[PDB]
């Protein structure tokens, strides 16, 4: 079955063969659509076909199909397997595999860069502690002083899902949240209850605006330990503004390496559930979401008195004037300290180069319009006008429950 | 079977039943996802008559009742007999506005209700079709204070002979490409606006020129029709602080009339339904004004502000697009033409949808066409999630007549 997807600006029509190779479900039926919905141990049995489909296309990938090296490769897997239950990745295929899940996470519009990520193997790891400085040597790595790099760390695999190795933290790096007893907030909305478990668990909190948390490890099933991040490797922004002065006095600033640390990484049926990955804003992220988002620092009343604008009523925009003024700080702020950052306009720009690669060299770019489309101008953006196609391939990141909820206490 | 929404702004949580209702295909499957995809018998009428004075009779509080049962019967008989059926006034009516409240890519259903049915079923000919119309368009300009109005024309008898408004909207300009290569008014509207200087139409080449009516009844070939002018209202636009936006020479109509989908009641097909409310500020500003390819004029706006273009990260478009946003506002406010801004119209649309699940246990909605264009998270509805699905009676896409008529 082919499918075509066309772009209303352009009239450029692509054809996808790829989705015929998308095993996992998306929630959607013949009869309903689920596409805005946020969130809609193995058997030896279910086993090895998804070790063999990863291993072909690994096998396929480097042009090696059929070769001795491809079957030796899966008979060794398949006794391994059957002997131990499960089994080890080479590390070629953890680089593969962690590359692809990149490429295949239709909700990332950045993926114009999936070839050039740095994969760190820290399958070797076994405690807390060590947890800890493999976090540092990937954080140091990544920021790099600024010219940020693309990387993931992979601690190691889930064995009975009793053992499991996960970072408690939903960032390696974001500001602690407190709710203060008159209801208000200080600092960040968004992260009160995972500050709150930091609190219980011994860290002293400077009840600040933007405390930078600490890092919750747990190592092979065990309770998380609490470490600090070097502050000296914690790398910030101070947001100002290139016309308005006041700006910086409203005394904002963000972090500058966005590290998503709770998802799952799954390749050829492994399960990664602390895989750690990094790479660089795009300025919405933080000027619209971040800042704008009522449930977050929520700052549009703020930015909008100082500007003066008519906010007795919604038609006069003032929340979108204030909008913009916000993000072009942001990004001067980022760009004038030579930090890494895209503008929404370039990022979308270069996805869609990177969406008609795709479709040419490999049949397809499953993507998830509602999440490709920036928060803000979305349809002076070319993806807005872009029909997309979403579907689930392997390997991929995909959403775990909280560790919180799961953990057995010891 | 019990599916649950939540809001991630507000985390209220509602669950949605109204959706075991749909019947219709959405597109999508366990597999593949299309919801940003545009475009995704006397035995076959009796189920579909059924299933609408069903929900019919049980929205006026007589579900199986003697009259529900012998209505039934009586378009049962009808349909065995003549092969189709009439639906009375109440039907006609309920229909429509339930075609309207089950629209999932209508952000302003909040005012459903309130629609006025004009039944234009006894028209004949294309100037009777030019008559209903003109008194749509001034029922619904009402001078200015829009009110929300549908004109039902005949129903489809055995496609041979149905009727058709060839614009895309009641109100469009025209669209011309010049030697230049460039293009002359509304490029959307290029082709249709060649069917007409070719069926005989005069056009003036300006950039905005009301395009005429070419209305198709019984099957026979279109005819135009110009529209008093005196009955198409315009505003110009002009900023409340730039005093050289007025020298763009940019206005719209202000009533927005969709005029080509196909209108479907208990298994009857409407051809021809152009129906109208109002404008959402961006539909104009950022999608008509601003679109690649429509009027494009993101850049002249720009270079008359005196921003850096240089690099993409000034943010320039973005500042340009909100100053041509607040202009159009201020333009229709000023004139006192009926306009709503994108925080507004989300704010009711989320009330109705709540006020849709506690009532009817859901509302269908399409999240890609519900977010505004612009300031996408700033209005409640990004923060919403949404199930889409199809309830009839609704409002469906049809061919263009130029692609399927036989002249
Ligand atoms: C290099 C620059 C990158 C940029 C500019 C970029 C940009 C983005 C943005 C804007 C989002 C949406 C974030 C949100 O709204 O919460 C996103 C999501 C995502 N990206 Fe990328 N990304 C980049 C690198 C990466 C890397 C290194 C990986 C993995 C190796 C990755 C995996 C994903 C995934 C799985 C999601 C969805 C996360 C979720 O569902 O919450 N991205 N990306
Ligand atoms: C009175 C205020 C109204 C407002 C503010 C409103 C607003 C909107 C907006 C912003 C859209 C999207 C338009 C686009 O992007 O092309 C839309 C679509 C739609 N509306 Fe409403 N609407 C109103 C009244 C009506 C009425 C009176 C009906 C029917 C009787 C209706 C039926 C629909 C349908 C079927 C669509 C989708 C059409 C398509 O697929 O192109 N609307 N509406
Ligand atoms: N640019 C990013 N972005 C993703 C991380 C930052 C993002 N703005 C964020 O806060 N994501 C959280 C909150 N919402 C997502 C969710 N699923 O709830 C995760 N990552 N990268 O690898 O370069
Ligand atoms: N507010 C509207 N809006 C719908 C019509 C105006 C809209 N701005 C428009 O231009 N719609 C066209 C172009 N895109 C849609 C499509 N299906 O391609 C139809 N209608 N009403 O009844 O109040
Ligand atoms: C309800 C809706 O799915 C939700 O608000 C989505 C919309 N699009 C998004 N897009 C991105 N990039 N990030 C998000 O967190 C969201 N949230
Ligand atoms: C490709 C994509 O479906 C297309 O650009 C859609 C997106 N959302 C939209 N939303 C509205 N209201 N109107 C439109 O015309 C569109 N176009
Ligand atoms: O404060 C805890 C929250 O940050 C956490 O529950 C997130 O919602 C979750 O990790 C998703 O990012
Ligand atoms: O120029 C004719 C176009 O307006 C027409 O083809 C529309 O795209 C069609 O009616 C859908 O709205
Ligand atoms: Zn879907």
Redo the contacts with the bound molecule.
């Keep these: 079955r082919f499918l075509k997807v066309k772009n209303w600006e352009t009239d450029v029509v692509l054809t996808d063969t790829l989705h015929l190779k998308s095993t996992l479900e998306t929630g959607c039926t013949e009869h309903i659509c689920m596409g805005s919905i946020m969130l809609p141990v193995r058997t030896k049995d279910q086993l090895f076909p998804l070790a063999k489909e990863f291993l072909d296309q690994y096998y396929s990938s480097i042009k090696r199909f059929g070769s001795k090296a491809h079957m030796d490769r899966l008979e060794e897997v398949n006794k391994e397997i059957e002997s131990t239950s499960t089994y080890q990745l080479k590390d070629t295929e953890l680089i593969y595999g962690?590359?692809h899940?990149?490429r295949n996470?239709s909700?990332?519009?950045?993926?114009i860069?999936?070839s050039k990520?740095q994969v760190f193997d820290a399958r070797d790891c076994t405690t807390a502690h060590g947890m800890f400085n493999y976090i540092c040597n990937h954080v140091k790595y990544a920021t790099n002083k600024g010219n940020?790099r693309?990387?993931?760390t992979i601690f190691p695999q889930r064995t009975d899902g009793k053992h499991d190795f996960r970072v408690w933290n939903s960032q390696l790096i974001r500001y602690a949240g407190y709710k203060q007893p008159d209801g208000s907030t200080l600092g960040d909305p968004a992260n009160v209850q995972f500050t709150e478990i930091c609190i219980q668990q011994g860290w002293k909190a400077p009840r600040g605006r933007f405390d930078v948390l600490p890092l919750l490890l747990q190592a092979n099933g065990n309770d998380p330990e609490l470490f600090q991040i070097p502050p000296e490797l914690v790398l910030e922004v101070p947001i100002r503004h290139p016309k308005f002065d006041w700006f910086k006095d409203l005394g904002l600033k963000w972090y500058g390496l966005?590290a998503?640390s709770n998802?799952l990484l799954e390749i050829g049926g492994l399960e990664f559930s602390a895989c750690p990955?990094?790479?660089?804003?795009?300025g919405?992220?933080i000027g619209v979401?971040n800042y704008c988002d009522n449930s977050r620092y929520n700052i549009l009343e703020e930015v909008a008195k100082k500007m003066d604008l008519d906010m007795r009523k919604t038609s006069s925009l003032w929340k979108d004037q204030a909008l913009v003024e916000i993000n072009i700080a942001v990004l001067y702020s980022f760009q004038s300290d030579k930090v890494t950052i895209?503008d929404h306009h370039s990022?979308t720009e270069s996805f869609i180069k990177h969406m008609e690669n795709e479709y040419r060299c490999r049949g397809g770019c499953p993507a998830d319009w509602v999440?490709i489309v920036?928060?803000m101008s979305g349809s002076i953006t070319p993806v807005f006008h872009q029909e997309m196609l979403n579907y689930r391939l392997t390997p991929?990141?995909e959403?775990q429950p909280d560790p919180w909820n799961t953990h057995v206490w010891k």
């Design positions: 962690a590359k899940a990149w996470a909700r990332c519009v950045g993926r860069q999936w990520l940020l693309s990387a993931i966005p998503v998802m990955f990094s790479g660089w804003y795009m919405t992220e979401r895209v990022a999440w920036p928060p991929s990141f959403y």
